[PDB]
């Protein structure tokens, strides 16, 4: 029984933009959550529907590790029952979410002198995302009566916005890397157990 590939997610060189968040399926392995509790300076570590001390014992059928980058002020939106541009239009947790949300400051990796163009978020969307939905559409957003046909202009907005992370921004505007763990618990045999 080999170790679950948590290092590949937490130690990715580059993270995904929140609108195109990454998901890693984790199965048929053995995970170690105790090391993750004291793995670094995880500013956020909130578990929902399960206890972090109990995580090192329970087994699960499937475990998903979703990862992305957001603003510091937006970290509060990665939680059940939240609203905002992130929870509504980029990454949505269900109300009965069973898992943990892990976030840490990454201003030394994901910011650029002059602003980083590499990280984006969906600013415009007609409706809210369903839980765990992923919308990578880059259609020009129609804000008026007349359709756009890929032409930007008045009432025709490119739907994604860059954060422009700079190393000198305040904490609320700095980049934060987020890892969301989900613990699917089906009637199938469990394949992911702690140690």
């Amino acid at each position: 029984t080999n170790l679950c590939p948590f290092g590949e997610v937490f130690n990715a060189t580059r993270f995904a933009s929140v609108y195109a968040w990454n998901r890693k399926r984790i199965s048929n392995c053995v995970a170690d959550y105790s090391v993750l509790y004291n793995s670094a300076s995880f500013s956020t570590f909130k578990c929902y529907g399960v206890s972090p001390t109990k995580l090192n014992d329970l087994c699960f059928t499937n475990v998903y590790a979703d990862s992305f980058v957001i603003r510091g002020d937006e970290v509060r939106q990665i939680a059940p029952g939240q609203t905002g541009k992130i929870a509504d239009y980029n990454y949505k947790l269900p109300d009965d979410f069973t898992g943990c949300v892990i976030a840490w400051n990454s201003n030394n990796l994901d910011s650029k002198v002059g602003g980083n163009y590499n990280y984006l978020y969906r600013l415009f969307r007609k409706s809210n995302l369903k839980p765990f939905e992923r919308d990578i559409s880059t259609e020009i957003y129609q804000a008026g009566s007349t359709p756009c046909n890929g032409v930007e202009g008045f009432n025709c907005y490119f739907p994604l916005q860059s954060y422009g992370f700079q190393p000198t921004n305040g904490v609320g505007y700095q980049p934060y890397r987020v890892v969301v763990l989900s613990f699917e618990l089906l009637h199938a045999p469990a394949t992911v157990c702690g140690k």
Partner: antibody
Amino acid sequence: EVQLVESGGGLIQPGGSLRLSCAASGLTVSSNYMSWVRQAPGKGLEWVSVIYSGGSTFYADSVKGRFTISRDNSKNTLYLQMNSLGAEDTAVYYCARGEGSPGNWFDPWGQGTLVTVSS
Amino acid sequence: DVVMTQSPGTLSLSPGERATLSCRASQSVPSSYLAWYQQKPGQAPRLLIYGASTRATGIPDRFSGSGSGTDFTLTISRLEPEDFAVYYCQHYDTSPRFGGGTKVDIKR
């Protein structure tokens, strides 16, 4: 012509309710960030509320729990229900498209309607 | 909660002179989150500059914004009698916040 037309201001007694209307032509209220901004007489601008296209609503802490922003898709109209009005609420209320965030500023604005809370 | 204060309170300059309006904060706000609005008497505010430096649509060339971090500047080169207004800076942290505004009077 893009335009936001406001109506519903006027006199109201303390503790009474009042609904403002922002009739839009040239933009779809249901597809935009739509905000309310007020300006007390002689003082500056204060943000009040915003409704998202997806339906999420937000309120400044000074009105949160007394005001209710809403819209009617078919009428292309933004609303603001104001309850338990007091002296702090006498202001010229503006509606605007946007939320004041990057790529999403307050533009355009309505002409503004005045709400006078007085017995 | 980033708080932003405008200075000076009122500005009195002759036409053709250079107007310097400052908007300073208690936190390093990125330039992309800063905007300026112009309100002339009896009228609604008008979006003047957004992104700290990007001139809005239809705004004259004399209006130019600059600054970053904890100090932003609105410059009105070649001041004109029609520039009589109050100028508000505005930013977004977790909600839209407005500055106190700077009144621009015109000497003659």
